[PDB]
């Protein structure tokens, strides 16, 4: 995300706001632009657009607005002290205490990003909008999924590009971010997949719309201009002249992964899937014979596997993604 975070985002934000949302941001980026990755994610999908809208509407039906959903389900905004406390408790719970550097920042386009600074893992947490019941989920996403998968993957024959080719691996995504997103909302009482759904939706529209149009369009789902600005930039990462239609479709991966994993949950071995590293749920049978599983780590929330599966059922119910609908969506 560092490469596609516009170098002039602030100056263009002030311009946008000060024009009362009529101006089209003219973004610039650190040269050179990752042309290959831009081209890979230049087209948006609509495969799950009705699921996205289904989730969004389910939230707004129950909570009226996002604003109330956030405050009612998310809990209080956290101080730095409270964040560190929750993180420390989590690391110990996961048995990875002292392995990851934790940093607090205001300039993240997401809640948190897991990185490799100084050839070492770094968890950057956005202090802006960090909330009590939500933060624990972020840790289950970045640490419980991304980090543990990463460490397990480093131990496997397919730990690098060559290894992936040699063993014939499908891409890690959408299985990676699908698993991570399900894990974020795992133990919540109202586990609505708002973030995933709205990202999916925003990209779909971004492909057709200017920035101005996209920003206005989102008003129907979320009022806060700052929140909307985030979603718009994420959807138009890499776009220079945002007056034209176009998107960076990467963030559609979350909902895409969720649907697929939930659809096939009955045949997926979730411990094994995590143990094999950065692998697709489809590659599990292919790679099982060649995986080294002696000292691979499974997240703490997967130990009671019966309960884990119940949570997945609860997540489907909540998000209006019942078995029958998943069945019709993917007749696999």
């Amino acid at each position: 995300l560092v490469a596609l975070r516009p170098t002039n985002m602030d100056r263009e934000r002030d311009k946008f706001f000060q024009s009362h949302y009529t101006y089209n941001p003219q973004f610039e980026y650190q040269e050179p632009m990752p042309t290959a990755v831009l081209e890979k994610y230049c087209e948006a999908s609509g495969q799950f657009i009705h699921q996205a809208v289904g989730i969004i509407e389910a939230v707004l039906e129950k909570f009226g607005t996002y604003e109330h959903f956030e405050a009612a389900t998310g809990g209080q905004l956290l101080t730095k002290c409270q964040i560190w406390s929750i993180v420390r408790k989590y690391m110990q719970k996961e048995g990875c205490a002292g392995e990851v550097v934790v940093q607090l920042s205001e300039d993240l386009l997401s809640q948190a990003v897991m990185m490799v600074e100084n050839s070492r893992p770094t968890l950057a947490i956005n202090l802006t909008g960090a909330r009590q019941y939500w933060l624990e989920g972020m840790l289950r996403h970045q640490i419980g999924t991304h980090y543990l998968r990463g460490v397990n993957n480093a131990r496997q024959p397919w730990h690098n590009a060559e290894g992936r080719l040699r063993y014939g691996l499908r891409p890690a995504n959408p299985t990676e971010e699908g698993l991570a997103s399900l894990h974020s909302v795992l133990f919540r009482k109202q586990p609505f997949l708002w973030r995933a759904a709205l990202l999916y939706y925003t990209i779909h529209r971004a492909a057709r719309m200017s920035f101005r149009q996209l920003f206005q369009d989102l008003e129907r789902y979320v009022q806060d201009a700052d929140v909307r600005w985030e979603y718009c930039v994420r959807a138009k990462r890499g776009q220079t002249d945002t007056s034209l239609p176009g998107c960076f479709s990467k963030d559609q991966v979350y909902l895409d992964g969720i649907v697929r994993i939930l659809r096939h949950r009955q045949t997926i071995d979730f411990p094994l899937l995590t143990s094999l590293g950065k692998v697709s749920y489809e590659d599990v049978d292919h790679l099982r014979p060649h995986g080294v599983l002696d000292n691979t780590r499974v997240p703490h929330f997967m130990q009671d596997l019966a309960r884990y599966r119940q949570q997945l059922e609860h997540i489907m119910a909540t998000n209006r993604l019942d078995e029958a609908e998943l069945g019709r969506l993917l007749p696999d």
Partner: peptide, 20 residues
């Protein structure tokens, strides 16, 4: 207090291992 929290954070961050 914020400064001391920051120092403790830096110590914890350095204590971890590097990837790759």
């Amino acid at each position: 207090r914020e400064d001391m929290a920051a120092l403790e954070k830096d110590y914890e961050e350095v204590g971890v291992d590097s990837v790759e």
